Amino acid sequence: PTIFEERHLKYISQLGKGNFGSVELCRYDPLGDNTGALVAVKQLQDQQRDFQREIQILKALHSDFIVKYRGVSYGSLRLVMEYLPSGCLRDFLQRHRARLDASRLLLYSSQICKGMEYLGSRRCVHRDLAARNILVESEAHVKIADFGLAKLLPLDKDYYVVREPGQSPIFWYAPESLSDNIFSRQSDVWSFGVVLYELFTYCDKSCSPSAEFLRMMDVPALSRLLELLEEGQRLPAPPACPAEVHELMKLCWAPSPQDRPSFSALGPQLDMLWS
Ligand SMILES: C[C@]1(NC#N)CCc2ccc(-c3ncnc4[nH]ccc34)cc21
């Protein structure tokens, strides 16, 4: 059931890209009559090693808040996952902003936090937590996706040091990630603070992390952002944001990783704000 034959996967369209790969919508149609199930299929476009690691990570994750691994097709050639037609949260928020209230945003925040608490329990660092990497199962259910940059922490080391600087938009990176290429479950907490900001602005482009940080900012942009952050400057409270939600973002944005709340400490606080 977890082995998908290449010849039966029928290409339909492109779903997206990210981290030198692509996601396609395919029908797994062994009958050849267009009645088979729709699946989301990820493939590559040393890269093979990081793709194999991603598959092994996702295959061992079992959560209502993490995108479901279905299987693999060999040539490992492709990663097969459940298809979520509503797509990424970032685009969903922009389209349905006039229908989703603060209660719904708090529900999504709590579900992402629960998925992140579970990833941390698995010693998994996501490294790319952003609304563009969160999928919408339904109007009341979100799931974390894209484990392309994810790392498993060894048993005796609670952080990870990357050899070369990242290729992701710099606006979600923690100061220790921007300065020393250090990543941990605490830098995932920083990124979650940016996710909370994204939810509460409904991913509005005009006040996005990139537009707002550029606005606030011969020195490179990365060094200028680090300077901004080291001074204690932070993204402003989104328009109409409840005061308590903004206070949580600021806690996620503590200068030192050790002072940031844990996902287990954040969870009951978001659950309390939701109700
Ligand atoms: C998060 C991200 N990369 C990945 N993995 C970034 C670009 C993109 C575009 C489409 C989808 C997608 N859409 C619908 N159902 C799905 N199931 C699994 C993935 C998926 C996911 C992604």
166 and 30 together in one domain: no
Three-class secondary structure of residue 138 per DSSP: strand
127 and 6 together in one domain: no
CB atoms under 10 Å from CB of 201, counted, come to 25
- Residue at a domain's end among 83, 101, 118: 83
202, amino acid identity? Y
Using the CB atoms, write b or e for 66-102: b if 16+ within 10 Å.
Answer: bbbbbbbbeeeebbbbebbebbbbbebbeeeeeebee
Is residue 130 lining ligand 1, measured as CB closer than 6 Å?
Answer: no
Q: After which residues is the chain broken (C to N over 2.5 A)?
A: 45, 75, 217
CB atoms under 10 Å from CB of 203, counted, come to 23
**Where do the H-state alpha helices sit in 122-220?**
175-180, 185-200, 209-216
> How many separate domains does the chain show?
2
Give the Cα separation of 51 and 70 in Å (integer): 16
Give the active site residue among 33, 50, 64, 128.
128
147 and 256 together in one domain: yes
Three-class secondary structure of residue 42 per DSSP: strand
183 and 259 together in one domain: yes
29, amino acid identity? D
Give the Cα separation of 43 and 50 in Å (integer): 12
35 and 117 together in one domain: no
Q: Is 156 annotated as catalytic?
A: no
181, amino acid identity? N
62 and 111 together in one domain: no
Is residue 91 lining ligand 1, measured as CB closer than 6 Å?
Answer: no
Domain region containing 9: 1-83
11 and 62 together in one domain: yes
Contact between 82 and 137 under an 8 Å Cβ cutoff? The reply is no
- Residue at a domain's end among 83, 109, 134: 83
- Taking the centre of ligand 1 as the mean of its atom positions, its distance from the CA of residue 18, in whole angstroms, is 9
133 and 196 together in one domain: yes
Q: Which H or E element spans position 273?
A: helix 263-274
Three-class secondary structure of residue 184 per DSSP: strand
64 and 98 together in one domain: no
For residue 272, what are the CA distances in angstroms to 39, 103, 112, 151?
Answer: 36, 11, 15, 31
Is residue 199 lining ligand 1, measured as CB closer than 6 Å?
Answer: no
Three-class secondary structure of residue 44 per DSSP: strand
Contact between 34 and 27 under an 8 Å Cβ cutoff? The reply is yes
Contact between 92 and 108 under an 8 Å Cβ cutoff? The reply is no
- Residue at a domain's end among 32, 52, 83: 83
CATH number at residue 42: 3.30.200.20
Question: Residue holding tokens 């005009």?
Answer: 206
CB atoms under 10 Å from CB of 180, counted, come to 11
The structure was resolved to a resolution in Å of 2.0
230 and 258 together in one domain: yes
113 and 101 together in one domain: yes
* HSE-up (13 A, CA, CB side) for residue 181: 7
Give the Cα separation of 235 and 237 in Å (integer): 7
- Indicate which residue's Cα is closest to atom 13 of ligand 1: 87
Three-class secondary structure of residue 10 per DSSP: strand
Strand partners, 71: 80
Question: Residue holding tokens 């598959």?
Answer: 55
Handedness of CA 115, 161, 208, 83 (dihedral sign): negative
133 and 247 together in one domain: yes
